[PDB]
Amino acid sequence: LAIEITTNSQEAAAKHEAQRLEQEARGRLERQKILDQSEAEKARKELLELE
Amino acid sequence: AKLFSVPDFVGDACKAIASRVRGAVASVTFDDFHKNSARIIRMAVFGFE
Numbered sequence A: 001l002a003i004e005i006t007t008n009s010q011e012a013a014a015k016h017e018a019q020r021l022e023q024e025a026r027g028r029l030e031r032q033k034i035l036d037q038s039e040a041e042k043a044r045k046e047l048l049e050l051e
Numbered sequence B: 001a002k003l004f005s006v007p008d009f010v011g012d013a014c015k016a017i018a019s020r021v022r023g024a025v026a027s028v029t030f031d032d033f034h035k036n037s038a039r040i041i042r043m044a045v046f047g048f049e
Helices: A002-050 B009-027 B030-045
Strands: none
8 A cells, every 4th residue: 555655646646747738738729829810810801801 | 903803794794784774764665765775775874974
């Protein structure tokens, strides 16, 4: 049970890590996404003018 | 003649080192030992400065 606790301790703080890295992804992605849509809107305006 | 003081000079020494480690490791948790065994022993044997 003493190695049990360390074995799950590895588990936990590994899953905490992949979760933190998970954040990084969606946190960055959600933002690259926004900066893309805005770039699209910089064009869409011109298009919407011709339209 | 002091050299030939302890009659089992090797026996004297292991006896003493085994004990020092044996005692210092009992204090320590396994995982904690396994990661630091180098320093854990290395200290247990010598009077840390």
